Amino acid sequence: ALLNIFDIAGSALAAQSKRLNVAASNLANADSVTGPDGQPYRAKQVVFQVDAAATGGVKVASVIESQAPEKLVYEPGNPLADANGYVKMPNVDVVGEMVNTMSASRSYQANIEVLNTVKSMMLKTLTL
Amino acid sequence: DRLDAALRFQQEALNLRAQRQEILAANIANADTPGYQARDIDFASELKKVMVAVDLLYRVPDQPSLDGNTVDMDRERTQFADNSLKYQMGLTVLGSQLKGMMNVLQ
């Protein structure tokens, strides 16, 4: 019942890394006017889940685009503008992404320390 | 030959642990090679087949990467630590069994 600790900690590490990647992507594309197809960029974020086969590690279910309405600015001399001359811009909270990165990094560090301590006990267990 | 088989179970377990460790080290070393595919083996089924010439499977990717590299870091690092711990556990079990067999002849 002590080898599941590695699985739980690895799942936590992977979930935190995915959240950090999503936050970095949002920060990078904070000011993306359009994507490949033409639709305006929309902020994305992960949805965690409990990875219980009873409790266990954390698990990322999927990635969803934020339901908050995208911003829109006035620019008639742009082919992307609609009939009213409004071009859509993504709705990204820069402070939100920053604090998400901070929390993800701290949780990453905590999980690393947990894994290190558990590895040390497991190593010392064999000296029975 | 009875001794051969009785120690052979653990000897083959240790050998497969060593092979898996080697593959993990290889995909750690090539972690930044573009166009690389992460490789791994299924320890339980491989051991069953050997007890009753090694095939390897492609690890399922978790995130996309433009340079075509699919070998993650965190998952395989946890796998490396787990494999090292289980290799040490197998080593000490085999050593205990051998010492118990030996001390009877004293």
Binding site: A14, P36, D37 | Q37, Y58, R59, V60, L66, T70
Partner: peptide, 21 residues
């Protein structure tokens, strides 16, 4: 399937098109 599991055939190539044709 689930990320981190094992599968028989490799992942498809990854591409980043600047503009969809």
């Amino acid at each position: 399937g689930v990320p981190g599991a094992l599968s028989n055939q490799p992942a498809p190539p990854n591409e980043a098109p600047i503009a969809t044709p």
